[PDB]
Amino acid sequence: DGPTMREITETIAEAKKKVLDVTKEAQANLLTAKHGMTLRESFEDNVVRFLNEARD
Amino acid sequence: DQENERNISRLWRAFRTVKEMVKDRGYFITQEEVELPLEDFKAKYCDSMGRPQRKMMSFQANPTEESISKFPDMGSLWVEFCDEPSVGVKTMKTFVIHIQEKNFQTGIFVYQNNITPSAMKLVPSIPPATIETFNEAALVVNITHHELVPKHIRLSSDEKRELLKRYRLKESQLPRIQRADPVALYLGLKRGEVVKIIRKSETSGRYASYRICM
Amino acid sequence: YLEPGHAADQEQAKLIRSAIEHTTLKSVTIASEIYYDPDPRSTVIPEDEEIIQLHFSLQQSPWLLRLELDRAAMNDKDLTMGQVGERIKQTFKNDLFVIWSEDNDEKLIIRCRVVAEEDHMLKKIENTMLENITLRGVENIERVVMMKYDRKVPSPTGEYVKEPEWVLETDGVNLSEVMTVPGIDPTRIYTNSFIDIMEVLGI
Amino acid sequence: HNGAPHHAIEEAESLLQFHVATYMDNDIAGQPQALQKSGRPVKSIRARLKGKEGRI
Amino acid sequence: SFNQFVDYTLQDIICEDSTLIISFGKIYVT
Amino acid sequence: TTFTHCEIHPSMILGVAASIIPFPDHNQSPRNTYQSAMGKQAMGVFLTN
Amino acid sequence: SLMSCISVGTDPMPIITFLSEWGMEPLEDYVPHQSPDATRVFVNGVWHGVHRNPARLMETLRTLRRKGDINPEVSMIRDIREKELKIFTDAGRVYRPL
Amino acid sequence: LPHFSKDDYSPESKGFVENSYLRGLTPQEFFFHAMGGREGLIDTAVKTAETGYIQR
Amino acid sequence: KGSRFISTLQVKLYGREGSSARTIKATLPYIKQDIPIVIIFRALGIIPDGEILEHICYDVNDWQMLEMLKPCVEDGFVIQDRETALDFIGRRGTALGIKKEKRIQYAKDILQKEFLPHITQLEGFESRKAFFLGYMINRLLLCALDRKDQDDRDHFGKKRLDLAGPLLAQLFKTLFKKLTKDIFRYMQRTVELAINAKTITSGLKYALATGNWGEQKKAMSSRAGVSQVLNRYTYSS
Amino acid sequence: TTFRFCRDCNNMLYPREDKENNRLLFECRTCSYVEEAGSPLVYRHELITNIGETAGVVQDIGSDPTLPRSDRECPKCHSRENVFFQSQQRRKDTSMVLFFVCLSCSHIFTSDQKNKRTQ
DNA sequence: AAGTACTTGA
RNA sequence: AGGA
DNA sequence: TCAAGTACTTTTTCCGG
Ligand SMILES: [Zn+2]
Ligand SMILES: [Zn+2]
């Protein structure tokens, strides 16, 4: 559907911002790593998890 | 107080497991004797400072009325603890001749840290009696109690002879338990002795396997 | 798996996590330094001028081994300057005189002195200190995570009900040791290394 | 059987040891590969019976 | 690749260690 | 505003075989890896001589 | 790929001659603490020396190749952060036109 | 890729294919899908022989 | 081009991350042991510490990299002049090659011809070869200090493709030199124009026909599959 | 740390304690040179390193096209023209904090909102 | 791609 | 040298 | 006497010139 494609695009769009927000949060040293994981390892886990939740 | 209290807990947990093993081997030990609490343990084997006196702990055990039915020649056992972290040929010769004079069949040395190779030479020196060396730390936890560890049962010479007859077996053909196997040690299995392992089954409900000793 | 009762208590799990997960003096240290501080009763470093004043009131090497500890790191693997220094003092016995800044004090410091030729001696004492000294935990057992695994258990009313519990997950194995640990269930403990299960619990 | 030049003997012996050796196994640890005049090494009896393709 | 080899590379190979107690000059490819 | 160079055409990342694939940007990654193997076993005119 | 080519192999000497003429201090005369920020110059993994203002050198070398004076199959890279200039006359390198 | 700025942890830089197969993939999306694709083909080819020996 | 000395130089950082005395030694071509960098530098001519250190570390405000060079200095401290350094290099064989004059003269040749054979195989280029060794240690320590990542073995820019020409080059070279020794064999024979042109033709023909890129009908290890028959199923094929 | 060499040998200086006057010296093991120490600090280990963060910041750092740009106002000159990168300390642990270099004043400022720097 | 067996210096 |  | 490298071992689905 034409409107379901609008809805799909905006689902990815909002998930892209959910990533940017975590990206800016980690760039500002505000991110707090999960026990037994790098600050980066923790960041990527979130990014990957957002983009996959999004793809679904 | 500090971190002294924890070595007390450990020595007591290790003691329970010794009583547990001895009862399980077929020796007469009460349940209340096993279930003895830590408070009662301190107020028995701790000195005029709360320092545990291992010399006091040592005990003799006797075959349950039931045991003399299956294994008649099953003699008396002597369990010896040591207040010395390293056990030398001097403390060993005391215990070794003790089992020989007091006509014991078996004896267990629950050592703290180590038994010197000098003292270890005296272990097979007094047959028909047998000697066992147990590092206190191994016995803090009873392995037999663990989820994955099933009921092992020692078979009499007659019971084994029958198992072999019933399945038309040579001893070769039986699945094997190693002499050094944690349970083979707990039970005090000797070479050629057979264990009947009764396990639960997702298939049958109850399944009985057998193992011959190494 | 945790002791029968206190299975839903998060702090009980947290407590074991700390008691089991391996911690070295290396993991808490920012940097170690060797200074020539000849007077044992007074320091060249003005920062330390206070640390001495106290750990004196209520012979030794003129060569000082000074290590700055990371406050943030001392928190994650919960630790006291006292308990850290205690390990050091108990490691090197009466042949290494240790002093330390308080947990409250703005910068975290540990001052060490020995009991001709000493420069290299201290570079060996520092190597031991970083690599050999164990603070908390069981060896081989690294990254220890907490997990709230779901557990199907019979309820009083008879029916099997979801009663989840706190479970520890390791990155490394030392069966003999973590089993003898207080506060856990040594009747439930499992390892993906079956060679270990064999060695400890039998064939 | 002739005038044994004694070294020339342990020299001729060692070579017989080599041929009787390589006839059975040609792929030995001690490097020379008893190569047929064509470059191609001689096929050992061991080689014949040796796993997947060949005898057993 | 082949052209760089013929007109260039080949002339160089022909005179690097070439000269013997007899020297090798310019190469010609028919 | 830093661009030192520009791509002639992105489709040039492809080699001989992939270059016969119609709309390869519309296929699952390996389905394309497969056509760049089959076209080599397709019959046609190999040379006019 | 369709546009890909392989470097056939050129002569390094005209570039080594050109470089020394454009401000390249020879390695035999280098003194690290005197010129410490000196961008180090390499031609086929051979350290030839250093150059004080690489910005200009890179520009002169770039327009030398771009004009045609340096063969267009020669590779030249300026890794500013690492303070390095690597040049390849080298045969084998896979190149594409942009 | 050289089409990106340095230290780019964005979805588009690290391989997120936003598009459907119907819409078509961008040159980057195509190459990243290709990298990911090639990984499968490697294990598929490897697993095939590794798995065989286990069976044996 | 010419000979192609496949000599590879390794500059090893001994000791693990947390081991006391972290030395830097290097394995030289036609040399048994691994020489501590400092001896190599003195054998090159760069004799005092700090002159050696100046070649490795280019910033006197980088105590980190410098403290890391303090072991090496202590390691090499036993050797003090160019001679004693060369002798130490010569001692480690060869096999050994006993004679004092022999070992010192050996190591001269190795540094000249075998060690870092690009740059030069000429004489007086100690300055260039030592500054390079120093550039190597700088890069070794830059990675060890977590300032640079370990090299990507799979970077395409660090890979070359030997095409039809160089393939033929390696082969022609092998052949012409086999011909060169055949010309010398007949020149010796003339104890007083019979040059087998077959070797070159037949050799090139053998390789290009079999795909066994190596001398000759006795192929292994010769590298096969190099030359194969052109696919003619379809034009794109 | 910052270590000295012998003026004469140029060979490195090793410490030696003046037991008589309780002061540190640096001696030369090639000759007989001896100088008094400048600092009481002999060796510094540094486990949690911050040196190599703002690595290779040449005055040409703005000329690299591969570098990204931003409109973040500079602390010194307030110029919204700057290049940025992350901690060049190639370690696993390392935070995603950014280092901005002003295209005018050339001052190195960070995006860190936990701490305050100078490098 | 991971072993068994054997030999080498602390 | 290819095919599943 | 025992850790560590040494020799040196061995496999890898199925089917035309
Ligand atoms: Zn001096
Ligand atoms: Zn500014």
Coordinates of N, CA and C in Angstrom, one line a residue, chain C residues 52-162:
Chain C
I52 N 50.7 10.7 55.4 CA 51.8 10.4 56.4 C 51.4 10.8 57.8
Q53 N 51.1 12.1 58.0 CA 50.7 12.7 59.3 C 49.8 11.9 60.2
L54 N 48.9 11.2 59.5 CA 47.8 10.4 60.2 C 48.3 8.9 60.4
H55 N 48.7 8.2 59.3 CA 49.2 6.8 59.3 C 50.5 6.7 60.0
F56 N 50.8 7.6 61.0 CA 52.0 7.7 61.8 C 51.6 7.7 63.3
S57 N 50.7 8.7 63.6 CA 50.2 8.9 64.9 C 49.1 7.9 65.3
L58 N 47.9 8.3 65.7 CA 46.8 7.4 66.0 C 46.1 6.9 64.8
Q59 N 65.7 2.8 58.8 CA 64.9 1.6 59.0 C 64.4 1.0 57.7
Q60 N 63.7 1.7 56.8 CA 63.1 1.4 55.5 C 63.7 2.1 54.3
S61 N 63.5 1.5 53.1 CA 64.0 2.0 51.8 C 63.8 3.5 51.6
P62 N 64.7 4.2 51.0 CA 64.4 5.6 50.6 C 63.7 5.7 49.3
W63 N 63.5 4.6 48.6 CA 62.8 4.4 47.4 C 61.4 4.1 47.6
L64 N 60.5 5.0 47.1 CA 59.0 4.9 47.2 C 58.3 4.4 45.9
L65 N 57.4 3.4 46.1 CA 56.6 2.9 45.0 C 55.2 3.4 45.3
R66 N 54.7 4.3 44.4 CA 53.4 5.0 44.6 C 52.5 4.7 43.5
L67 N 51.2 4.2 43.8 CA 50.2 3.9 42.8 C 48.9 4.5 43.0
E68 N 48.4 5.2 42.0 CA 47.2 6.0 42.0 C 46.1 5.0 41.5
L69 N 45.0 4.9 42.3 CA 43.9 4.0 42.0 C 42.7 4.8 41.4
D70 N 42.0 4.2 40.5 CA 40.8 4.8 39.8 C 39.5 4.6 40.6
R71 N 39.0 5.7 41.1 CA 37.7 5.8 41.9 C 36.6 5.1 41.3
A72 N 36.3 5.4 40.0 CA 35.3 4.8 39.2 C 35.4 3.3 39.1
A73 N 36.7 2.8 38.9 CA 37.0 1.3 38.8 C 36.8 0.6 40.2
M74 N 37.2 1.4 41.3 CA 37.1 0.9 42.7 C 35.6 0.7 43.1
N75 N 34.7 1.3 42.3 CA 33.3 1.3 42.5 C 32.6 0.1 41.8
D76 N 32.8 -0.1 40.4 CA 32.3 -1.1 39.6 C 32.5 -2.5 40.2
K77 N 33.7 -2.8 40.6 CA 34.1 -4.1 41.3 C 34.3 -3.5 42.7
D78 N 33.2 -3.4 43.5 CA 33.1 -2.7 44.8 C 34.3 -3.0 45.7
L79 N 35.1 -2.0 46.0 CA 36.3 -2.1 46.8 C 36.6 -0.8 47.7
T80 N 37.3 -1.1 48.8 CA 37.8 -0.1 49.8 C 39.3 0.0 49.6
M81 N 39.8 1.2 49.8 CA 41.3 1.5 49.8 C 41.9 0.6 50.9
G82 N 41.2 0.4 52.0 CA 41.6 -0.4 53.1 C 41.8 -1.8 52.7
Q83 N 40.7 -2.5 52.1 CA 40.8 -3.8 51.7 C 41.8 -4.1 50.6
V84 N 42.0 -3.1 49.7 CA 43.0 -3.2 48.6 C 44.4 -3.3 49.2
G85 N 44.7 -2.3 50.1 CA 46.0 -2.2 50.7 C 46.2 -3.4 51.7
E86 N 45.1 -3.9 52.2 CA 45.2 -5.0 53.1 C 45.8 -6.2 52.4
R87 N 45.3 -6.4 51.2 CA 45.8 -7.5 50.3 C 47.3 -7.3 50.1
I88 N 47.7 -6.1 49.7 CA 49.1 -5.8 49.4 C 50.0 -6.1 50.7
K89 N 49.6 -5.6 51.9 CA 50.3 -5.8 53.1 C 50.4 -7.3 53.5
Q90 N 49.2 -8.0 53.3 CA 49.2 -9.4 53.6 C 50.0 -10.2 52.5
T91 N 50.1 -9.7 51.3 CA 50.8 -10.4 50.2 C 52.4 -10.4 50.5
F92 N 52.9 -9.2 50.7 CA 54.4 -9.0 50.9 C 54.8 -9.1 52.4
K93 N 53.9 -9.5 53.3 CA 54.1 -9.7 54.7 C 54.8 -8.4 55.4
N94 N 55.7 -8.7 56.4 CA 56.4 -7.7 57.1 C 57.7 -7.1 56.4
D95 N 57.9 -7.4 55.1 CA 59.1 -6.9 54.3 C 58.7 -5.9 53.3
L96 N 57.5 -5.3 53.5 CA 57.0 -4.1 52.7 C 56.0 -3.3 53.5
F97 N 56.5 -2.1 53.9 CA 55.7 -1.1 54.7 C 54.8 -0.3 53.8
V98 N 53.5 -0.6 53.9 CA 52.4 0.1 53.1 C 51.5 1.0 54.0
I99 N 51.2 2.2 53.3 CA 50.3 3.3 53.8 C 49.4 3.5 52.7
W100 N 48.2 4.1 53.0 CA 47.2 4.4 52.0 C 46.3 5.6 52.3
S101 N 45.9 6.3 51.3 CA 45.0 7.5 51.4 C 43.6 6.9 51.7
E102 N 42.8 7.6 52.4 CA 41.5 7.2 52.7 C 40.5 7.3 51.6
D103 N 39.4 6.4 51.6 CA 38.4 6.3 50.6 C 37.7 7.6 50.3
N104 N 37.6 8.5 51.4 CA 37.1 9.9 51.4 C 38.1 10.8 50.6
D105 N 39.5 10.7 51.0 CA 40.6 11.6 50.4 C 40.4 11.7 48.9
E106 N 40.5 13.0 48.4 CA 40.3 13.4 47.0 C 41.0 12.6 45.9
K107 N 42.2 12.1 46.1 CA 43.0 11.3 45.2 C 43.3 10.0 45.9
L108 N 43.2 8.8 45.2 CA 43.5 7.5 45.7 C 44.9 7.0 45.6
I109 N 45.7 6.9 46.7 CA 47.1 6.6 46.7 C 47.5 5.5 47.7
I110 N 48.5 4.7 47.3 CA 49.1 3.6 48.0 C 50.6 3.8 48.0
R111 N 51.2 4.1 49.2 CA 52.6 4.3 49.3 C 53.3 3.1 49.9
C112 N 54.4 2.6 49.2 CA 55.1 1.4 49.6 C 56.6 1.6 49.7
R113 N 57.3 1.1 50.7 CA 58.7 1.1 50.9 C 59.1 -0.3 51.3
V114 N 60.4 -0.7 51.0 CA 60.9 -2.0 51.4 C 61.4 -2.1 52.8
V115 N 62.1 -3.2 53.2 CA 62.6 -3.3 54.6 C 64.2 -3.2 54.8
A116 N 72.8 -1.3 49.6 CA 73.2 -1.1 48.3 C 72.3 -2.0 47.3
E117 N 72.0 -1.3 46.1 CA 71.1 -1.8 45.0 C 69.6 -2.1 45.4
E118 N 68.7 -1.2 44.9 CA 67.3 -1.2 45.2 C 66.3 -0.8 44.1
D119 N 66.8 0.0 43.1 CA 66.0 0.5 41.9 C 65.1 -0.6 41.3
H120 N 65.8 -1.7 40.8 CA 65.3 -2.9 40.1 C 64.4 -3.7 41.0
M121 N 64.7 -3.9 42.3 CA 64.0 -4.6 43.3 C 62.5 -4.2 43.4
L122 N 62.3 -2.9 43.4 CA 61.0 -2.3 43.4 C 60.2 -2.5 42.1
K123 N 60.9 -2.5 40.9 CA 60.3 -2.7 39.6 C 59.8 -4.2 39.5
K124 N 60.3 -5.1 40.3 CA 59.9 -6.5 40.4 C 58.7 -6.6 41.4
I125 N 58.7 -5.8 42.5 CA 57.7 -5.7 43.5 C 56.4 -5.1 42.8
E126 N 56.6 -4.2 41.9 CA 55.5 -3.6 41.2 C 54.9 -4.5 40.2
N127 N 55.7 -5.4 39.6 CA 55.3 -6.4 38.6 C 54.4 -7.5 39.2
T128 N 54.9 -7.9 40.4 CA 54.2 -8.9 41.3 C 52.8 -8.2 41.5
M129 N 52.8 -7.1 42.2 CA 51.7 -6.2 42.6 C 50.6 -6.2 41.5
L130 N 51.0 -5.8 40.3 CA 50.0 -5.7 39.2 C 49.5 -7.1 38.8
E131 N 50.4 -8.0 38.3 CA 50.1 -9.3 37.8 C 49.7 -10.4 38.8
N132 N 50.4 -10.6 39.9 CA 50.2 -11.7 40.9 C 49.2 -11.4 42.0
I133 N 49.0 -10.2 42.4 CA 48.0 -9.9 43.5 C 46.5 -10.0 43.0
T134 N 45.8 -10.8 43.7 CA 44.3 -11.1 43.6 C 43.6 -10.4 44.8
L135 N 42.6 -9.5 44.4 CA 41.9 -8.8 45.4 C 40.6 -9.7 45.8
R136 N 39.6 -9.7 45.0 CA 38.3 -10.4 45.1 C 38.4 -11.6 44.2
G137 N 37.3 -12.4 44.1 CA 37.1 -13.4 43.1 C 38.0 -14.7 43.1
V138 N 37.5 -15.7 42.4 CA 38.0 -17.0 42.1 C 38.8 -16.9 40.8
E139 N 40.0 -17.5 40.7 CA 40.8 -17.4 39.5 C 40.1 -18.1 38.3
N140 N 40.4 -17.7 37.0 CA 39.9 -18.1 35.8 C 38.5 -17.6 35.5
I141 N 37.7 -17.3 36.6 CA 36.4 -16.7 36.5 C 36.4 -15.2 36.2
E142 N 36.2 -14.8 35.0 CA 36.2 -13.4 34.6 C 34.8 -12.9 34.5
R143 N 34.5 -12.0 33.5 CA 33.2 -11.4 33.3 C 32.0 -12.2 34.0
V144 N 31.5 -11.7 35.1 CA 30.3 -12.4 35.8 C 29.1 -11.6 35.7
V145 N 28.1 -12.1 34.9 CA 26.8 -11.4 34.7 C 25.7 -12.0 35.5
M146 N 24.7 -11.1 35.8 CA 23.5 -11.5 36.5 C 22.3 -11.7 35.5
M147 N 21.5 -12.7 35.6 CA 20.4 -13.1 34.7 C 19.2 -13.4 35.5
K148 N 18.0 -12.9 35.1 CA 16.8 -13.3 35.8 C 16.0 -14.3 35.0
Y149 N 16.6 -15.6 35.0 CA 16.1 -16.7 34.3 C 14.7 -17.1 34.9
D150 N 13.7 -17.5 34.1 CA 12.4 -17.9 34.5 C 12.5 -19.4 35.0
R151 N 11.8 -19.7 36.1 CA 11.8 -21.1 36.6 C 10.4 -21.6 37.0
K152 N 10.1 -22.8 36.4 CA 8.8 -23.5 36.6 C 8.9 -24.3 37.8
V153 N 8.1 -23.9 38.8 CA 8.1 -24.6 40.1 C 6.7 -24.8 40.7
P154 N 6.5 -26.0 41.4 CA 5.2 -26.3 41.9 C 4.9 -25.3 43.0
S155 N 3.7 -24.6 42.9 CA 3.2 -23.7 43.9 C 2.5 -24.5 45.0
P156 N 2.2 -23.9 46.1 CA 1.5 -24.6 47.2 C 0.2 -25.2 46.8
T157 N -0.6 -24.5 45.9 CA -1.9 -24.9 45.4 C -1.7 -26.1 44.4
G158 N -0.5 -26.6 44.2 CA -0.2 -27.7 43.3 C 0.3 -27.5 41.9
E159 N -0.3 -26.5 41.2 CA 0.1 -26.2 39.9 C 1.5 -25.6 39.7
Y160 N 2.1 -25.9 38.6 CA 3.5 -25.5 38.3 C 3.4 -24.0 37.9
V161 N 4.1 -23.1 38.7 CA 4.1 -21.7 38.4 C 5.5 -21.0 38.2
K162 N 5.5 -20.0 37.2 CA 6.7 -19.3 36.8 C 7.2 -18.4 38.0

